[PDB]
């Protein structure tokens, strides 16, 4: 309900980068005011990068007028052939049509419901803020950053707890993968005698120099 | 490239023969040893230094030598 305030356009664009073009109810959740239908409409009618918001060419105007006589009032058909969007095509044709002739019953009334707020440009962020336009932005920032889960936090803490318990047990005192070699595959015999090599390995295992983790 | 690292393997071969061994070293080791065959398997008589040479040689080589999303794009600007 209401036109798009520029913070919403940018949260929608960041979400389209994070989430893609088919997650409009995931994107709809960052924005509290807007529903997935409106997010989708805003993207396709104003924020599609492939929308030419540039000034109108005049090859384009004569295409638009050719089409508006070929497929009369079929702006959804006409629009991709011009290359613009149906609201751009529609009001551009209205402009050109008044250019020929050179209140109005044909304009928005104060307190009426605008049909396509998703076609109008974004109301820019204002000199102030609101806990709506700041709590939404902070929700957006977090939800745009987070990809983790929670039990990793347990992880390190749990290991530390266990380490502390081990230390306490040591103070009180104050398979087996070290008795056996796990599923040991001994190197196969070759042409060279490895008796001496085996002795050296045992000596190396016997060594106990201080080493940090 | 296997040709690049092949001339680098020959780098290492000629460098290490220039670095660890000498012609009279070689020829007197031979003069002690008439068989330079059918002796395969039995370890040959060579100075105990030789071993660490290899080791030191290769160890020489050694001292010459979000988060995951950044890597992805960093492959694409690389490519695109």
């Amino acid at each position: 309900g209401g036109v798009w305030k520029n913070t919403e356009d940018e949260i929608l664009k960041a979400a389209v980068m994070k989430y893609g073009l088919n997650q409009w109810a995931r994107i709809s959740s960052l924005l509290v005011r807007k529903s997935a239908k409106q997010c989708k409409a805003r993207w396709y009618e104003w924020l599609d990068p492939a929308i030419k918001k540039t000034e109108w060419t005049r090859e384009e105007d004569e295409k638009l007028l050719h089409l508006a006589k070929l497929m009369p009032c079929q702006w959804r058909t006409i629009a991709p052939i011009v290359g613009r969007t149906p609201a751009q095509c529609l009001d551009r044709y209205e402009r050109l049509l008044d250019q020929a002739v050179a209140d109005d019953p044909r304009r928005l009334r104060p307190g009426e419901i605008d049909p396509n707020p998703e076609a109008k440009p974004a109301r820019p962020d204002a000199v102030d803020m609101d806990e709506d336009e700041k709590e939404m932005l902070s929700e957006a920032r977090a939800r745009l950053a987070n990809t983790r889960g929670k039990k990793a936090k347990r992880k390190a803490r749990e290991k530390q707890l266990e380490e502390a318990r081990r230390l306490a047990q040591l103070q009180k005192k104050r398979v087996d993968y070290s008795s056996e070699v796990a599923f040991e595959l001994k190197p196969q015999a070759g042409f060279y005698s490895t008796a001496d090599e085996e002795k050296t390995t045992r000596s190396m295992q016997q060594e106990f120099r201080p080493v940090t983790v | 490239a296997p040709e690049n690292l092949y001339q680098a393997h020959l780098k290492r071969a000629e460098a290490g023969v220039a670095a660890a061994y000498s012609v009279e070293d070689y020829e007197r080791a031979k003069a002690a040893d008439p068989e330079f065959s059918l002796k395969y398997g039995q370890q040959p008589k060579l100075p105990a230094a030789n071993v660490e040479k290899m080791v030191a040689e290769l160890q020489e080589r050694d001292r010459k030598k979000n988060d995951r999303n950044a890597h992805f794009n960093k492959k694409i600007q690389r490519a695109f």
Partner: peptide
């Protein structure tokens, strides 16, 4: 006075440094 472009906020998110994990404490080991 400054507005809200994306990228800068993305950089801020990068600063929010995610949860890259803190290194295990180097407790002295006997």
């Amino acid at each position: 006075d400054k507005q809200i472009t994306a990228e800068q906020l993305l950089r801020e998110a990068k600063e929010i440094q995610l949860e890259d994990d803190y290194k295990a404490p180097k407790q002295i080991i006997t």
